[PDB]
Amino acid sequence: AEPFAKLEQDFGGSIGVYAMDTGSGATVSYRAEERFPLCSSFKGFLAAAVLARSQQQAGLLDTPIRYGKNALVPWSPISEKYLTTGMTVAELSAAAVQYSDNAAANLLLKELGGPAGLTAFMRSIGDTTFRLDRWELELNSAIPSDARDTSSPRAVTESLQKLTLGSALAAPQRQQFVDWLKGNTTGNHRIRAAVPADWAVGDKTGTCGVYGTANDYAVVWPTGRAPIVLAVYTRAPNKDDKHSEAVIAAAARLALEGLGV
Amino acid sequence: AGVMTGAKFTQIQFGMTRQQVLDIAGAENCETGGSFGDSIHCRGHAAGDYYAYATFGFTSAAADAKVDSKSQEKLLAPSAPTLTLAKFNQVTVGMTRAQVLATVGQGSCTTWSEYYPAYPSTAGVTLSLSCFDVDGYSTGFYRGSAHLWFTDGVLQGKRQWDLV
Numbered sequence: 001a002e003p004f005a006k007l008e009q010d011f012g013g014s015i016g017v018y019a020m021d022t023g024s025g026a027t028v029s030y031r032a033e034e035r036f037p038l039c040s041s042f043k044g045f046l047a048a049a050v051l052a053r054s055q056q057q058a059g060l061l062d063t064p065i066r067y068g069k070n071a072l073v074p075w076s077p078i079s080e081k082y083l084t085t086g087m088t089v090a091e092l093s094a095a096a097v098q099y100s101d102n103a104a105a106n107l108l109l110k111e112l113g114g115p116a117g118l119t120a121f122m123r124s125i126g127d128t129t130f131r132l133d134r135w136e137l138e139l140n141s142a143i144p145s146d147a148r149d150t151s152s153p154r155a156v157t158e159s160l161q162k163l164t165l166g167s168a169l170a171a172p173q174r175q176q177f178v179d180w181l182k183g184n185t186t187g188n189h190r191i192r193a194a195v196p197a198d199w200a201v202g203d204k205t206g207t208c209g210v211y212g213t214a215n216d217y218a219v220v221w222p223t224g225r226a227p228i229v230l231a232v233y234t235r236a237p238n239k240d241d242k243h244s245e246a247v248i249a250a251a252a253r254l255a256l257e258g259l260g261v
Numbered sequence: 262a263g264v265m266t267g268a269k270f271t272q273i274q275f276g277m278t279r280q281q282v283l284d285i286a287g288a289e290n291c292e293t294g295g296s297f298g299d300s301i302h303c304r305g306h307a308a309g310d311y312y313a314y315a316t317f318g319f320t321s322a323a324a325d326a327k328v329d330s331k332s333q334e335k336l337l338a339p340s341a342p343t344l345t346l347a348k349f350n351q352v353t354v355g356m357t358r359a360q361v362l363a364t365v366g367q368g369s370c371t372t373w374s375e376y377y378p379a380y381p382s383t384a385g386v387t388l389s390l391s392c393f394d395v396d397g398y399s400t401g402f403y404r405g406s407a408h409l410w411f412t413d414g415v416l417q418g419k420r421q422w423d424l425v
Contacts, residue, residue, distance in 0.1 A: 040310040069410040100310040207310035209402030
């Protein structure tokens with residue numbers, strides 16, 4: 001607790017942490033009930049919602065999606081390149097999770113009935129906190145005290161555990177979600193920076209770009225132990241406060257230390 | 262030799278081979294296969310929720326294939342960003358590249374993507390410009406930008422974010 005307060009003071013903002021050891025049931029909690037902007041971290045849950053829907057819509061993942069240049073938004077590395085041929089729902093999902101591809105995430109939101117559709121899926125797994133209200137890129141505004149496009153560190157972690165380790169997805173879909181998170185490319189300086197190199201990690205990052213607001217959540221499999229699931233979110237009071245990946249990694253170290261890992 | 266850079270992006274030319282691209286970008290910065298298929302994707306430093314990057318497309322999967330497509334975000338800075346919501350609104354479908362540049366500002370834009378589907382022929386060339394207002398290019402988090410896209414040098418459409 002005292003360490004978290006010191007870290008967030010140095011940062012110049014607020015840090016939100018929740019971590020659970022799925023073996024012992026132990027937890028670590030700091031501002032775990034407070035709302036933080038989701039930023040691009042919503043994209044992991046979006047992929048999970050797509051997976052769940054495939055359980056009731058045969059052939060969904062294989063469905064080719066065509067789009068033109070009007071569908072492009074900044075930060076769309078994969079979707080920009082496949083413009084001329086389109087991409088499948090699966091390829092869009094991989095891009096959104098592993099490269100934080102913006103246009104891909106919007107295309108998938110459209111498949112699921114928009115931000116409200118994603119929110120309704122999260123309510124269906126028992127998450128009463130999560131809300132997505134807007135699309136990329138507008139959802140990144142991160143205005144202090146604005147509840148739009150936010151969740152809490154505990155709600156993120158609880159939902160992540162249900163989807164990756166629990167029964168919220170059928171087995172094949174659940175493994176696919178884990179595989180996507182394990183292949184994320186954007187998280188090397190966050191939770192992954194806090195753990196020994198031999199521990200497997202799947203994660204999804206978010207970065208709003210204003211108000212010191214960024215985050216990461218992850219399932220971590222320490223050598224010889226049950227998985228740990230955790231979320232680390234930050235925010236700050238000034239629009240021009242910059243986020244800090246090092247602060248996210250530091251809070252992650254405190255969390256794991258707190259579970260005795 | 263460090264990460265991918267705008268200088269390296271500019272050094273790479275349409276027509277180069279896979280090996281020439283890797284030799285310039287630095288192979289440790291690049292990936293192929295997977296989400297990228299037979300294109301080569303090269304990373305710079307962290308920005309947005311990802312990285313400044315380049316992507317190079319090739320005429321085929323063949324080893325002797327040639328670069329027919331160059332894309333980047335956050336590798337190249339606009340020389341003099343002066344785009345405004347008002348200038349954006351004056352851009353019209355059917356304009357030439359020259360007409361667009363005069364309207365949004367001669368130094369407002371960088372090339373987001375440039376593709377030659379008939380390479381080496383320039384017939385059917387498609388181009389996306391990323392254009393910025395005075396403080397629009399930053400961190401990768403833009404304070405007002407636009408996407409202007411062309412086919413055969415003629416504006417096909419436009420979109421903006423946060424312009425004023």
